[PDB]
């Protein structure tokens, strides 16, 4: 598990840390082409699944690309998030990823807006 608001670096001119109504925090005000960087993520044993707690009031879907090494590095999967009913209505959404082990920098690269609280890598 990784908290979006605990990124090491980012590329954005708009991203803000936001709250949720449950007393948590996360990332909003994301625009197309922004990315969050999480350095030295040990995928440990194995990961073939990605789950994120996300909210969206957008009227088009946002793709969250999961890239290793650089923003144009190996693409291991893409979570596509349509509206959840509103910007403060969080749901947990999952995608499969190419099985990943070892230590990589992780770039979440966004095609549009989404509010994100946290994400979890697991093996189904
Ligand atoms: O304390 C807590 C508060 O922090 C919390 O505040 C909420 C923080 O998050 C806010 O959500 C932002 C709402 O505004 C969005 O910008 C939208 C994004 O969509 C744009 O339009 C898009 C254009 O591109 C199209 O292709 C796409 O389909 C469209 O959707 C629109 O122009 C922008 O206005 C941000 O992305 C969100 O992060 C939320 O409103 C606050 O309420 O509230 C709870 C409290 O406990
Ligand atoms: Ca969070």
CATH of residue 38:
2.60.120.260
Ligand nearest to the CA of 118: 2
Resolution to one decimal, Å: 1.6
Lateral strand order in the sheet of 103-110: 9-11, 35-42, 103-110, 62-68, 74-81
Report the alpha-carbon angle 27-31-11, nearest 5: 75
CA of 60, closest atom in ligand 1: 28
Please provide the DSSP assignment of 8-67 as one string: SEEE-SS-EEEE-TTS-EEEE---TT-EEEEEEEE--S-EEEEEEEEEE--SS-EEEEEE
18 touches ligand 1 (CB under 6 Å): yes
Which structural domain range is residue 46 located in?
1-124
CA of 115, closest atom in ligand 1: 38
> Environment class of residue 42 by beta-carbon count within 10 Å: exposed (0-12), middle (13-18) or buried (19+)?
exposed
The candidate with the shortest Cα–Cα distance to 65, out of 88, 25, 33, is 33
Structure tokens at 28: 């909003």
Strands 47-56 and 115-122, bridge-based pairing: antiparallel
Structure obtained using: X-ray
What is the C-alpha R_g of the chain? 13
Q: Is 117 annotated as a binding residue?
A: yes
Domain tally for the chain?
Answer: 1
Q: Is 3 annotated as a binding residue?
A: yes
């Amino acid at each position: 598990k990784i908290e979006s608001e605990e990124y090491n670096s980012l590329k954005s001119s708009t991203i803000q840390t936001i709250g949720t109504s449950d007393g948590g925090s996360g990332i909003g005000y994301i625009e197309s082409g922004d990315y969050l960087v999480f350095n030295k993520i040990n995928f440990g044993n194995g990961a073939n699944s990605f789950k994120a707690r996300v909210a969206s009031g957008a009227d088009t879907p946002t793709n969250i690309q999961l890239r290793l090494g650089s923003p144009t590095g190996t693409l291991i999967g893409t979570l596509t998030v349509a509206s959840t009913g509103g910007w403060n209505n969080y749901e947990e959404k999952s995608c499969s990823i190419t099985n990943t082990t070892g230590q990589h920098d992780l770039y979440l690269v966004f095609s549009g807006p989404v509010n994100i609280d946290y994400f979890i890598f697991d093996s189904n």
